[PDB]
A and B are shown apart, each in its own frame.
Chain A
Amino acid sequence: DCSSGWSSYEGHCYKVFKQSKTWADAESFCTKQVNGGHLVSIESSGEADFVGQLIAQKIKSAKIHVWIGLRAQNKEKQCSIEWSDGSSISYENWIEEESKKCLGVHIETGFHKWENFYCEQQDPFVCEA
Chain B
Amino acid sequence: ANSFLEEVKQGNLERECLEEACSLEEAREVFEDAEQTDEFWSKY
Contact flag (A, B; Cβ within 8 A):
yes
Bound-state CA distance A43–B25 (Å) is 28
Q: Is the CB of B21 within 8 A of A63?
A: yes
Q: Which residues of chain B are near A38, meaning CB under 8 Å? A: none
Q: Is the CB of B25 within 8 A of A97?
A: yes
Bound-state CA distance A118–B44 (Å) is 19
Query: Nearest CB to that of A107 among chain B residues?
Result: B21
Q: Is the CB of A63 within 8 A of B25?
A: no
Bin the interface of chain A by size: 10 to 19
Q: Is the CB of A121 within 8 A of B24?
A: yes
Q: Is the CB of A64 within 8 A of B23?
A: yes
Q: Is the CB of A63 within 8 A of B28?
A: no
Q: Which residues of chain A are near B22, meaning CB under 8 Å? A: 63
Q: Is the CB of B23 within 8 A of A65?
A: yes
Bound-state CA distance A61–B17 (Å) is 13
A62 within 8 A of B: yes
Q: Which residues of chain B are near A64, meaning CB under 8 Å? A: 23-24
Question: Smallest distance from the beta carbon of B28 to chain A beta carbons, Å?
Answer: 6
Bound-state CA distance A116–B28 (Å) is 16
Q: Which residues of chain A are near B21, meaning CB under 8 Å? A: 61-63
Bound-state CA distance A92–B6 (Å) is 27
- Residues of A that sit less than 8 Å from B by CB: 61-65, 97, 108, 117-118, 121
Complex A-B: 16 CB contacts under 8 Å:
A61-B21, A62-B1, A62-B21, A63-B21, A63-B22, A63-B23, A63-B44, A64-B23, A64-B24, A65-B23, A97-B25, A97-B28, A108-B1, A117-B25, A118-B25, A121-B24
